[PDB]
Amino acid sequence: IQRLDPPEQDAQIDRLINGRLTTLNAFVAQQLVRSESAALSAQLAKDKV
Amino acid sequence: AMQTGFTTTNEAFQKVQDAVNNNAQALSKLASELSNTFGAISASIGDIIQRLDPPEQDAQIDRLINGRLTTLNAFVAQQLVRSESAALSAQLAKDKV
Amino acid sequence: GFQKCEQLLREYGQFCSKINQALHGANLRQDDSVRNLFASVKSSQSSPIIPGFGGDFNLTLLEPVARSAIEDLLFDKVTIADPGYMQGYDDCMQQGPASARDLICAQYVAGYKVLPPLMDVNMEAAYTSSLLGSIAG
Amino acid sequence: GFQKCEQLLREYGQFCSKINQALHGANLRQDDSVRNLFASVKSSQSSP
Amino acid sequence: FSVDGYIRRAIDCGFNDLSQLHCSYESFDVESGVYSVSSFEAKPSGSVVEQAEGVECDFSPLLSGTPPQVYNFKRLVFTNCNYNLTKLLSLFSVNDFTCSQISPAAIASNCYSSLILDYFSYPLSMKSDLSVSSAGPISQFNYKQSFSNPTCLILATVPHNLTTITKPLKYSYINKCSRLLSDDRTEVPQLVNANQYSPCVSIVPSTVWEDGDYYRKQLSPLEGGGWLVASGSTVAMTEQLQMGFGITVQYGTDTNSVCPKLEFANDTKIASQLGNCVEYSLYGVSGRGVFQNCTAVGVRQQRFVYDAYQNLVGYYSDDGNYYCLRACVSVPVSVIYDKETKTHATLFGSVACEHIYGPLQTPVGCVLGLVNSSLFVEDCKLPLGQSLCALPDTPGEMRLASIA
Amino acid sequence: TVDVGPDSVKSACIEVDIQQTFFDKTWPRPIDVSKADGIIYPQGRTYSNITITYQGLFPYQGDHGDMYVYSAGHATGTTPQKLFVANYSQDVKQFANGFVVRIGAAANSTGTVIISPSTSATIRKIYPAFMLGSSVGNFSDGKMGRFFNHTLVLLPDGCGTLLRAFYCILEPRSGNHCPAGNSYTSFATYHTPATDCSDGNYNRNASLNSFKEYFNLRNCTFMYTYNITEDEILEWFGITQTAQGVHLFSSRYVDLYGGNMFQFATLPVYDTIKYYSIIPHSIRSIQSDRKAWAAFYVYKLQPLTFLLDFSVDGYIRRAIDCGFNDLSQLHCSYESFDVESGVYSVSSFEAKPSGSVVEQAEGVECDFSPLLSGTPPQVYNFKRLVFTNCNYNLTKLLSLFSVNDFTCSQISPAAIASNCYSSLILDYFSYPLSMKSDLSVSSAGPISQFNYKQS
Amino acid sequence: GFGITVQYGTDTNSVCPKLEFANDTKIASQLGNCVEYSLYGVSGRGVF
Numbered sequence A: 001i002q003r004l005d006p007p008e009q010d011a012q013i014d015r016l017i018n019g020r021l022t023t024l025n026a027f028v029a030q031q032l033v034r035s036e037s038a039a040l041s042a043q044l045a046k047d048k049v
Numbered sequence B: 001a002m003q004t005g006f007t008t009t010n011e012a013f014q015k016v017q018d019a020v021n022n023n024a025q026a027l028s029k030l031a032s033e034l035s036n037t038f039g040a041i042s043a044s045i046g047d048i049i050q051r052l053d054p055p056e057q058d059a060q061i062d063r064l065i066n067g068r069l070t071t072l073n074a075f076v077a078q079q080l081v082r083s084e085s086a087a088l089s090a091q092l093a094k095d096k097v
Numbered sequence C: 001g002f003q004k005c006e007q008l009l010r011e012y013g014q015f016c017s018k019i020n021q022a023l024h025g026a027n028l029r030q031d032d033s034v035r036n037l038f039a040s041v042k043s044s045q046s047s048p049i050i051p052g053f054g055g056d057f058n059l060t061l062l063e064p065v066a067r068s069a070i071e072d073l074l075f076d077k078v079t080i081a082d083p084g085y086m087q088g089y090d091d092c093m094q095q096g097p098a099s100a101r102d103l104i105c106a107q108y109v110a111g112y113k114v115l116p117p118l119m120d121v122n123m124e125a126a127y128t129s130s131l132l133g134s135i136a137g
Numbered sequence D: 001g002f003q004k005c006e007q008l009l010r011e012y013g014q015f016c017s018k019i020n021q022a023l024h025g026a027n028l029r030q031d032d033s034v035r036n037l038f039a040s041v042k043s044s045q046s047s048p
Numbered sequence E: 001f002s003v004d005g006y007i008r009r010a011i012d013c014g015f016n017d018l019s020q021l022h023c024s025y026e027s028f029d030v031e032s033g034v035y036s037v038s039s040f041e042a043k044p045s046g047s048v049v050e051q052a053e054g055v056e057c058d059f060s061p062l063l064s065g066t067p068p069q070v071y072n073f074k075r076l077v078f079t080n081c082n083y084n085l086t087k088l089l090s091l092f093s094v095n096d097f098t099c100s101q102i103s104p105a106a107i108a109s110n111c112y113s114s115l116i117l118d119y120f121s122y123p124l125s126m127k128s129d130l131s132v133s134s135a136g137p138i139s140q141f142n143y144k145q146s147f148s149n150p151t152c153l154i155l156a157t158v159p160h161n162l163t164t165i166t167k168p169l170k171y172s173y174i175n176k177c178s179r180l181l182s183d184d185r186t187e188v189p190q191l192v193n194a195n196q197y198s199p200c201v202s203i204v205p206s207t208v209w210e211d212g213d214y215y216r217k218q219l220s221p222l223e224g225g226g227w228l229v230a231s232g233s234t235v236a237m238t239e240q241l242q243m244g245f246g247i248t249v250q251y252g253t254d255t256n257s258v259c260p261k262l263e264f265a266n267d268t269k270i271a272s273q274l275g276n277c278v279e280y281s282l283y284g285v286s287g288r289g290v291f292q293n294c295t296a297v298g299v300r301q302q303r304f305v306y307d308a309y310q311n312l313v314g315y316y317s318d319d320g321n322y323y324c325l326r327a328c329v330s331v332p333v334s335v336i337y338d339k340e341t342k343t344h345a346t347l348f349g350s351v352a353c354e355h356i357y358g359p360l361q362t363p364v365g366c367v368l369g370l371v372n373s374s375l376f377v378e379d380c381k382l383p384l385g386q387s388l389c390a391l392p393d394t395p396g397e398m399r400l401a402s403i404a
Numbered sequence F: 001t002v003d004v005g006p007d008s009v010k011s012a013c014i015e016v017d018i019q020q021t022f023f024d025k026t027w028p029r030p031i032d033v034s035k036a037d038g039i040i041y042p043q044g045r046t047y048s049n050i051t052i053t054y055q056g057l058f059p060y061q062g063d064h065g066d067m068y069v070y071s072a073g074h075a076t077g078t079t080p081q082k083l084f085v086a087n088y089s090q091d092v093k094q095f096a097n098g099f100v101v102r103i104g105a106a107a108n109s110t111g112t113v114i115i116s117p118s119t120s121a122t123i124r125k126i127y128p129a130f131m132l133g134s135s136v137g138n139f140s141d142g143k144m145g146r147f148f149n150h151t152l153v154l155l156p157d158g159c160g161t162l163l164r165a166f167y168c169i170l171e172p173r174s175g176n177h178c179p180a181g182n183s184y185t186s187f188a189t190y191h192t193p194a195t196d197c198s199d200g201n202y203n204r205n206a207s208l209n210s211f212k213e214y215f216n217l218r219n220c221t222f223m224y225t226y227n228i229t230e231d232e233i234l235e236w237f238g239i240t241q242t243a244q245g246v247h248l249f250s251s252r253y254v255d256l257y258g259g260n261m262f263q264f265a266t267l268p269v270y271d272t273i274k275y276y277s278i279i280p281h282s283i284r285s286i287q288s289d290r291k292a293w294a295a296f297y298v299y300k301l302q303p304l305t306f307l308l309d310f311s312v313d314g315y316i317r318r319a320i321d322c323g324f325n326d327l328s329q330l331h332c333s334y335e336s337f338d339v340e341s342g343v344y345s346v347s348s349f350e351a352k353p354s355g356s357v358v359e360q361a362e363g364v365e366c367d368f369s370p371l372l373s374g375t376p377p378q379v380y381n382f383k384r385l386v387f388t389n390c391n392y393n394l395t396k397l398l399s400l401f402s403v404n405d406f407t408c409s410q411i412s413p414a415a416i417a418s419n420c421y422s423s424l425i426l427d428y429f430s431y432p433l434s435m436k437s438d439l440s441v442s443s444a445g446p447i448s449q450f451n452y453k454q455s
Numbered sequence G: 001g002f003g004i005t006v007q008y009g010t011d012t013n014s015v016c017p018k019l020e021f022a023n024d025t026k027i028a029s030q031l032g033n034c035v036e037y038s039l040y041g042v043s044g045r046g047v048f
C-alpha cells in the first residue's frame, strides 16, 4: 500500500491473498485428513481397551 | 421407549442428519462458488466479453477459470475423501451385521 | 458455454477429463460398496415375517408395514431434499426452487448432477426384512 | 487488519466462513471421539 | 496417428454423447459402464431487450461559454438517458481518445448506471501529465481519474466554427498544494483524490493571474488549523482551445439506464416469449433464461430480484408484469455403453420424456436406446440407479431389466 | 445560475436567544439493528425471502447519535418575540461518509415544550434543517458556523410539506443580529404558524424567507423542492456523497411504515462535503399555543457488513451488525439469525496502536549539485549520482527544470517523493525530447538497445 | 533526461524525505505500548 497505487497495488495484494487462501485451504484439508485418521484410530483404541 | 427417541438427545439420530447435511454441503460448494469473481470485474463471462477487449478480457476470464478449476479440484478431493470414508464405514457395517 | 473461455480452458490440459474420471471412480466405489454390503446382509435361509412375529416380544416396530415403522419414522424425521430422480428437471421449471439455496434445482443451473443410488427403496427394505426373519434361527 | 485487503478478500466469497466451519466441525470431531472413547474405557465396577 | 503418421481413424468429439466419452478418455476403446457426459444444452430461441428509452443525455452545457481550468473541471452526470458519444465527439477535432478498463467498442455501446463527464480547458502540450503513471502537477494536484471505474480520456481541439465555446486568457493549473501544520515546520502535500477536487481549489482563482502566484488560506481549528497554500502556473493560450474530457462509467449502482438508443422490435418483448429460452439484456443486465409470468416478490421499485447466490431470479418489467426468471436448464446426459457389443443407450436423468422405439420413461429419467423387457437380472453390469439395469442383447438394443 | 427569489429587505434579523441548558435532554434512541433502524436498502436490486450479508454504509449497532430538538420561541401572550434555540449552528460536525436521521420518533407522545419545562404538549414531527459544505470558519464576531463558497442547504418548509434543497453561496447580512452585523448570536430559521400555517394555504417560503434574513443567497446552482405528505409517522432520512453527487434517501416514498431508506434524489454537488451543521429552527408560536416538537437523531454511517433479512415483500425488517460483538460475528459467519448451540471461535479482539515511533536518518541533504554544473553527458555516457544516508527532496531538483514528462514505474507518484530507500540512483544526461519514446520499455529503437536502459 | 532508480532493502533505508520529529515518536517513551513504527523505512505494528 505504501509503495503502489490501486491498479498495481491491487495486483500485489491479490497475489498475497491467493497465496494465503491456498495455505489455509491446504491447512484445513489436512486438519480434516488428520482428524479423520485420528477418529478411526480412536475406534481402534476403543476396541483394544 | 425408542419409538419417541428420534429427537435432539439421540446422538445416533443426529449422525443420520449430519450425513445428510454433509451431502448438502458438498453440493453447496458448487452452487455457491459460481457467484464469486476471484478478483475479476464480474462473475459473468458474458460481462467480461461485453466490456473488454482480448488482452484484458483474457486476464479476467482466466481469473474466473482459475477460481472454478480450484473449486472443482477441492470438490473432487472431498468426494474422494468422503467416498473413502464411507467405504471404510461400509465395511464396519458389514462386520456389525 | 462461452467459446472464449473454453479456448482458454484448453491451455490447462485435460482438466475436465480428470474431474470426470475422478468422480466416475468415486461413484463406482459406492455402487461396489453397496453391492458388497448387501451381499453380506443377505440371508441364505430365513423365516417369513408375519404379524405377531416376536411372540411376547413386541417387534411390531420392526415388522414391515415395505419399510418398517421405525424405518419410516427415521426417514420422516430427517430433513432430506428430494433429488427428483425421475423428473426433477421439470419440477424445477414448473414449480421452481423450494427455497433459498435449493441445491437440487441448482443442478440444472450450475452444471452438476445428483445420481440415483444403486438399489431402490423396496430392494433395500427386502434385504433388511429378510435379515429380521433370519435372526432367531 | 488492512482494509484494502479485506475489500479484495470479499470477492473470493465467504472464504473465511468455510475455513471456520470446516475447522469447527473437525474440532467437534475430537471432542466427540474423546467422549466416546472414554465412555467405553470407563468401568462399571472396579477395585480400589 | 499410425506409425507412419497418417490419420486413419478419428472421433468427432461433439457428434454425440458416445463420441464425447471416447474423447474424454482419449481412446477409441473405453470400458463398459455408465458415464456422465456433457449435458444437452438448451439454446436460445430468441432474445428480449428492455432499455431506458427517452430523453437524450444532454451535453449542451459543455458547448456554451468558457470551459473551466483543469482544477475547476465541470461535471455532467448522466443517468436515465440515451447517450451518443459520436454526437459529442463529432463536434471537436479529437486529438487523443483512449480508454482504460473498458474496450473502445464498449464505451460507445454498453449500458451504464451512470456516465460522468468531466470537462476542462487543457493544453495538448501537457497531454502526458494526465497519464496514470504521471508524477507531474496535473495528476498530483489538479485532476485524477478513477482507478476503480472504467474511464476514458479525450483530448480535443475546439474547431474555429464552434463559436459557442469561448477561450480563457490562458491555461492554468496548480503546481503546488499543501498544508502547513500549526508548528509551521511541517508541510504536507495535498494530493488530489480521483474524481475529486483539490483542497486548494478554494484558494486558487478561476484563472491564475501569472505563473508563480502564491495563495494562502488560514484554516480554522475544525479544518485542523495551520495554512493551506498553493502555487499556480500558466500555459500560453493556443489559437484553438484545447479541451480535455474525462469519462467515468459505473455499471451497477442502479438500473443501467444510460444506454445507446435502440430501435425496438416487438419480438424482443418478454410477454411474447414466455416459456422460451432467450438471451436477455434488461437495462444492462444480461444472460440467458426463461421468463415466466408469476407473483411479485421483492421491492418493485428496485426492478431486479436476486436470490441468495446473486443470480437474477425475477424482474419487474416496464410493461407492468413481474416475471420469474429461470435459467435455461440443461438436460442431463449419461451414456450407457457396452464395449463387447459396441452398443449404447442414452439416459437423461431426472428428465421427463416430454422433452426428448421412442423414448422410455424410467424411475431414473428418460432413456433412449433401451427397450422395456420386463426381465429380471441379478448379474447387472450396467446399473442405472434405483433397481434398474441396462442389459445388452447378445447385437441388438439394450434391454431395460430390473434387478431381482 | 438559478434565481431563488428576491433578497430579504429587512434591516434587521430577529434576535436569537441561545440557552443550551434547556436543550440538554436525555431521550436516548440508539440504533437497533435488529429492528433494522437506519438501513438504506441495497441500491441497485432487491431480494426476496433470503438472509444474506451485505457490505454498505450503515450506522453502528447501539449508536446513540446526536440528538437535536427544535423549540418554540419566546412570547408574551399573542405576540411572539425572540427566537429560542440550542447552540446548534456553532456545533459543526465532520461529514465523513454521511448520515441517517431518525425523524418524529416521539410523535404522539406527551412531551415538553422546551422553552417552558413545566408545560406539556403532544409531540409533533418536525423536519431537520441542515447546512453542509467543504469549508468552515467563523463569522465577524468570532463565532463559528460560517460556511464558505457553495454550501448545500436542506431546508424543510411549508410547515413540513416540502423539502427545499439548494446549493448556493451564503453571504452574511450586516443588519442587526445578522452574522455580519451587531449583536449576533446564532442565525436561525423560523416560521410563524399564526400566519404561515393556515389550514389551506401554507406559506411554502416561510423558512426560506427567514433563512434569507441572515444570509443573501448568491450563485445558486440549483434549488429543488420535494413534496412531503403530512403525517406523524416515524421516518428516516439519509445523506451520502459519491462522484455522482449528493444522494438523498428517505423511507417515505417507498417503505413508509417499514422505515427502509431508498434514494429519492441526487443533487449536483461535486465538491466534497466535509462539514455539516444543524440549522436551528424556532417556531414563533404564541405563548398560549406552544407545541412539543419531536427530537431528531443523527447517526453517522460507515462501511460495515450487515446480515440483512429480506422479507417476501423485500423489505429489511431485521439485521445484524457483524462487527458489534462476537455473538454478532457468529451470526454473520453462518449467514443466519439462528445458529446452533456450541462454542465457536470468532475473530480475535485486535490490539490497536496507541501511538507511533519513527526513526529516520536525519542530516545532510542529498547533493544534486554536480548535475547543475557544466555540460551534461550524452545518453550513452550518462552520469550517475548515488545517494545513500541523506535527506532527499525531489521538488528541490524538479523545480529547477521545466519538466516535460515525469513518469514512474513499479512505484506510485506519491511514493517516489515520500518513501525511504536503501539508495536512490540518479542517472542524468542530455536528451532531445523528440526522441522521448525511444526511452520507453517497449521500445526497440537505438536508445533502449544501445545507449540507456532502465532497471 | 533523468533516470531515477530506487532500492528498498540492501541497507538501512537511509535515503528519506526530511522529517521534523516530535519527541512523542521516540521508542523509549512508548515502551510496552502497541505502536505503529517506521524505522529507517521498515514498518509495521508492534510493542517495543
Ligand SMILES: *[C@@H]1O[C@H](CO)[C@@H](O[C@@H]2O[C@H](CO)[C@@H](O[C@@H]3O[C@H](CO[C@H]4O[C@H](CO)[C@@H](O)[C@H](O)[C@@H]4O[C@H]4O[C@H](CO)[C@@H](O)[C@H](O)[C@@H]4O)[C@@H](O)[C@H](O[C@H]4O[C@H](CO)[C@@H](O)[C@H](O)[C@@H]4O[C@H]4O[C@H](CO)[C@@H](O)[C@H](O)[C@@H]4O)[C@@H]3O)[C@H](O)[C@H]2NC(C)=O)[C@H](O)[C@H]1NC(C)=O
Pocket: E084, E085, E086, E087, E090, E260, E261, E262
Ligand atoms: C449518434 O450521433 C451521430 C452524430 O449526430 C449520428 O450520426 C449521424 O446520423 C445521421 C442520420 O441519422 C447522418 O445523416 C446522413 O448524412 C448523409 C451525408 O450527406 C451529406 O453529404 C451529402 C453529399 O452529397 C449532401 O448532399 C447532404 O446534404 C449532406 O451534407 C451535409 O453537409 C453539408 C456541408 O458540407 C451541409 O450543407 C448539409 O446541410 C449537410 O449537413 C446523408 O446522405 C444521409 O441522407 C440519407 O438519410 C436521410 C435521413 O433523413 C434521408 O432523408 C436521405 O434521403 C438519405 O436517405 C436515402 O439514402 C440512404 C442511404 O444513405 C437509404 O438508407 C435511405 O432509404 C434513402 O434511400 C443523412 O442525412 C449524419 O451524417 C451522421 N453523422 C455522423 C457524424 O455520424 C448517429 O446516428 C447517432 N446514433 C444514434 C443511435 O442515434
Ligand SMILES: *[C@@H]1O[C@H](CO)[C@@H](O[C@@H]2O[C@H](CO)[C@@H](O[C@@H]3O[C@H](CO[C@H]4O[C@H](CO)[C@@H](O)[C@H](O)[C@@H]4O[C@H]4O[C@H](CO)[C@@H](O)[C@H](O)[C@@H]4O)[C@@H](O)[C@H](O[C@H]4O[C@H](CO)[C@@H](O)[C@H](O)[C@@H]4O[C@H]4O[C@H](CO)[C@@H](O)[C@H](O)[C@@H]4O)[C@@H]3O)[C@H](O)[C@H]2NC(C)=O)[C@H](O)[C@H]1NC(C)=O
Pocket: E176, E180, E184, E187, E212, E214, E216, E227, E229, F393, F394, F395, F396, F399, G017, G018, G019
Ligand atoms: C523540498 O524542496 C522544495 C523546493 O526547494 C521546498 O519548497 C519551498 O519551501 C519554502 C519554505 O521553506 C517556500 O518558501 C515560501 O515562499 C512563499 C512565496 O513567496 C514568494 O512570493 C511572494 C509574493 O508576495 C513574495 O513576496 C516572496 O518574497 C516570494 O517571492 C520569491 O520570488 C521572487 C521573484 O518573483 C523573488 O524576488 C523573492 O526573493 C522570492 O524568491 C513565501 O510567502 C513564504 O514565506 C512564509 O514563510 C517564511 C519562512 O521563512 C516566513 O519568513 C514568511 O514570513 C512567511 O511566513 C508567514 O506566512 C506563512 C504562511 O504562508 C505562515 O505559516 C507563517 O507562520 C508566517 O505567518 C516562504 O518564503 C518555497 O516557495 C518552496 N518552493 C517550492 C518550489 O515548493 C520544500 O519545503 C522542501 N521540503 C522539505 C521537507 O524540506
Ligand SMILES: *[C@@H]1O[C@H](CO)[C@@H](O[C@@H]2O[C@H](CO)[C@@H](O[C@@H]3O[C@H](CO[C@H]4O[C@H](CO)[C@@H](O)[C@H](O)[C@@H]4O)[C@@H](O)[C@H](O[C@H]4O[C@H](CO)[C@@H](O)[C@H](O)[C@@H]4O)[C@@H]3O)[C@H](O)[C@H]2NC(C)=O)[C@H](O)[C@H]1NC(C)=O
Pocket: E201, E202, E203, E204, E205, E206, E217, F148, F149
Ligand atoms: C471561497 O471562499 C473564500 C472565503 O469567502 C474566498 O476567499 C475570499 O476572497 C475574497 C476575494 O476573492 C477576499 O476579499 C478581499 O479581496 C481583496 C482583493 O483585492 C483586489 O480586488 C479588490 C476588489 O475590490 C480591489 O479593490 C483591490 O484593489 C484588488 O484588486 C483584498 O484586497 C481584500 O483585503 C481587505 O481585507 C484585508 C484583511 O486582512 C485587509 O488587510 C485589506 O487591507 C483589505 O481591507 C479582501 O481580502 C476575502 O478576504 C477572502 N476571504 C478569506 C476568508 O480569505 C474564496 O475566494 C472563495 N473561493 C472561490 C474559488 O470562490
Ligand SMILES: *[C@@H]1O[C@H](CO)[C@@H](O[C@@H]2O[C@H](CO)[C@@H](O[C@@H]3O[C@H](CO[C@H]4O[C@H](CO)[C@@H](O)[C@H](O)[C@@H]4O)[C@@H](O)[C@H](O[C@H]4O[C@H](CO)[C@@H](O)[C@H](O)[C@@H]4O)[C@@H]3O)[C@H](O)[C@H]2NC(C)=O)[C@H](O)[C@H]1NC(C)=O
Pocket: F104, F105, F106, F107, F108, F231, F232, F233, F234, F257
Ligand atoms: C402517531 O400516530 C399515528 C396514527 O395516529 C401512527 O400512524 C399509523 O402508523 C401505523 C403503523 O405504521 C399505520 O398502520 C399501517 O397502515 C398500512 C396502510 O394502512 C393503510 O391501508 C390499509 C389497508 O391496506 C388501511 O386499512 C389503513 O387504514 C390505511 O389506509 C398498513 O399496510 C400497514 O400494515 C403493514 O404493516 C403491518 C405491520 O406494521 C403488517 O402487519 C401488515 O401486514 C402490513 O405489512 C399498517 O397497518 C397506520 O395506518 C398509521 N396511521 C395513519 C393515519 O397513517 C404514527 O405511526 C404514530 N407515530 C409514532 C412516532 O408512533
Ligand SMILES: *[C@@H]1O[C@H](CO)[C@@H](O[C@@H]2O[C@H](CO)[C@@H](O[C@@H]3O[C@H](CO)[C@@H](O)[C@H](O[C@H]4O[C@H](CO)[C@@H](O)[C@H](O)[C@@H]4O)[C@@H]3O)[C@H](O)[C@H]2NC(C)=O)[C@H](O)[C@H]1NC(C)=O
Pocket: F002, F003, F004, F005, F006, F204, F205, F208, F222, F223, F224, F225
Ligand atoms: C419562494 O421560493 C421559490 C423557490 O422555490 C421562488 O421561486 C422562484 O421564483 C422566481 C420568480 O419569482 C423564478 O424566476 C423566474 O423564472 C422564470 C422561468 O421562466 C423566468 O422566465 C423569469 O424571468 C422573468 O423575470 C425576471 C425577474 O427578474 C427578469 O429578470 C427576466 O428578464 C424575466 O422578465 C424569472 O427568472 C425562479 O426561477 C423560481 N425559482 C425556483 C428555484 O423555482 C419564489 O420566488 C419564492 N417566492 C417569494 C415570494 O420569495
Ligand SMILES: *[C@@H]1O[C@H](CO)[C@@H](O[C@@H]2O[C@H](CO)[C@@H](O[C@@H]3O[C@H](CO)[C@@H](O)[C@H](O)[C@@H]3O)[C@H](O)[C@H]2NC(C)=O)[C@H](O)[C@H]1NC(C)=O
Pocket: B003, C058, C059, C060, C061, C069
Ligand atoms: C406393540 O407396540 C406398539 C407400539 O410400538 C403398540 O401399538 C401402539 O398402541 C398405542 C395404544 O396405546 C397407540 O396409541 C394411539 O396413538 C394414536 C396416535 O394418534 C392416538 O390417536 C390414539 O388415541 C392412541 O394414543 C400407538 O399409536 C400404537 N402404535 C403403533 C405403531 O401401532 C402395540 O399395541 C404393541 N402390541 C402389543 C401386543 O402390546
Ligand SMILES: CC(=O)N[C@H]1[C@H]([C@H](O)[C@H](O)CO)O[C@@](O[C@@H]2[C@@H](O)[C@H](O)O[C@H](CO)[C@@H]2O)(C(=O)O)C[C@@H]1O
Pocket: F019, F022, F073, F074, F075, F076, F084, F115, F116, F117, F118, F287
Ligand atoms: C428559556 C427561558 O428563559 N425560559 C423561561 C420562560 C420564558 O421566558 C417565557 O416562556 C417567555 O414567553 O419563562 C418561564 O417563566 C414563566 C413566567 O416568566 C411567565 O410569567 O409565566 C409562566 C407561566 O405562565 C412562567 O412562570 C417559564 O415559562 O417556565 C421561565 C423559563 O426559565
Ligand SMILES: Nc1nc(=O)c2nc(CNc3ccc(C(=O)N[C@@H](CCC(=O)O)C(=O)O)cc3)cnc2[nH]1
Pocket: F026, F027, F028, F029, F030, F069, F106, F110, F111, F112, F113, F114, F123, F292, F293, F294, F295, F296
Ligand atoms: N419536545 C420534545 N421532544 C421530544 O422528542 C421529547 N421526547 C420525550 C421522551 N423521550 C424519551 C426517549 C427515550 C426514552 C426511553 O425510554 N429510553 C430508555 C433507554 C433506551 C436505551 O438506551 O436503550 C430508558 O429506559 O430511559 C424515554 C423518553 C419527552 N419530551 C419530549 N419533548
Ligand SMILES: *[C@@H]1O[C@H](CO)[C@@H](O[C@@H]2O[C@H](CO)[C@@H](O)[C@H](O)[C@H]2NC(C)=O)[C@H](O)[C@H]1NC(C)=O
Pocket: C099, F049, F312
Ligand atoms: C420464505 O422462506 C421460508 C423458509 O425460511 C419458507 O418456509 C418454508 O416453507 C416450506 C414449504 O414447503 C416448508 O416445507 C418449510 O418447512 C418452511 N420453513 C420454515 C422455516 O418455516 C416460506 O414459505 C417462504 N415464503 C414464501 C412466500 O416463499
Ligand SMILES: *[C@@H]1O[C@H](CO)[C@@H](O[C@@H]2O[C@H](CO)[C@@H](O)[C@H](O)[C@H]2NC(C)=O)[C@H](O)[C@H]1NC(C)=O
Pocket: F020, F024, F087, F088, F090, F091
Ligand atoms: C454546544 O452544546 C453542547 C451540549 O451542551 C456541548 O457539548 C458538550 O460539551 C461538554 C464540554 O465538557 C461535554 O462535557 C459534553 O459531554 C458535550 N455534550 C455532548 C452531548 O457531547 C458543545 O461543546 C457546545 N458547542 C459549542 C460550540 O459551544
Ligand SMILES: *[C@@H]1O[C@H](CO)[C@@H](O[C@@H]2O[C@H](CO)[C@@H](O)[C@H](O)[C@H]2NC(C)=O)[C@H](O)[C@H]1NC(C)=O
Pocket: F001, F169, F218, F219
Ligand atoms: C456570482 O454571480 C455574479 C453575477 O452572475 C458573478 O459576477 C459578478 O457579479 C457582480 C455583481 O455585482 C459584479 O460586480 C462582478 O463584476 C461580476 N464578476 C464578473 C467576473 O463578471 C460572480 O462572479 C459569481 N460569483 C461566483 C463565486 O461564482
Ligand SMILES: *[C@@H]1O[C@H](CO)[C@@H](O[C@@H]2O[C@H](CO)[C@@H](O)[C@H](O)[C@H]2NC(C)=O)[C@H](O)[C@H]1NC(C)=O
Pocket: F204, F226, F227
Ligand atoms: C408539490 O406540491 C405543490 C403544491 O401542491 C404542487 O404545485 C401545485 O400544482 C398544481 C397543479 O395543478 C397547481 O394547480 C397549484 O397551484 C400548484 N401549487 C403551487 C403552490 O404552486 C407541485 O406541483 C408538487 N410537485 C410535484 C413534483 O408534484
Ligand SMILES: *[C@@H]1O[C@H](CO)[C@@H](O)[C@H](O)[C@H]1NC(C)=O
Pocket: E159, E160, E161
Ligand atoms: C466556418 O463557416 C464558414 C461559412 O462560409 C466557412 O466558409 C468556413 O470554412 C467554416 N470554417 C470551418 C473551420 O469549418
Ligand SMILES: *[C@@H]1O[C@H](CO)[C@@H](O)[C@H](O)[C@H]1NC(C)=O
Pocket: E266
Ligand atoms: C409489431 O411490429 C409491427 C411491425 O410493422 C407493427 O406493424 C405492429 O403494429 C406492431 N405491433 C404492435 C402491438 O405495436
Ligand SMILES: *[C@@H]1O[C@H](CO)[C@@H](O)[C@H](O)[C@H]1NC(C)=O
Pocket: E271, E293, E294, E321
Ligand atoms: C400474470 O399473471 C397475473 C395474475 O396471475 C395476470 O392478471 C397477468 O395478466 C399475467 N400477465 C401475463 C403477461 O400473462
Ligand SMILES: *[C@@H]1O[C@H](CO)[C@@H](O)[C@H](O)[C@H]1NC(C)=O
Pocket: E360, E361, E362, E363, E372, E373, E374, E400
Ligand atoms: C415395462 O413394461 C411393464 C409392463 O408389464 C410395466 O409394468 C413397466 O413399468 C414398464 N417399465 C417402464 C420403465 O416403462
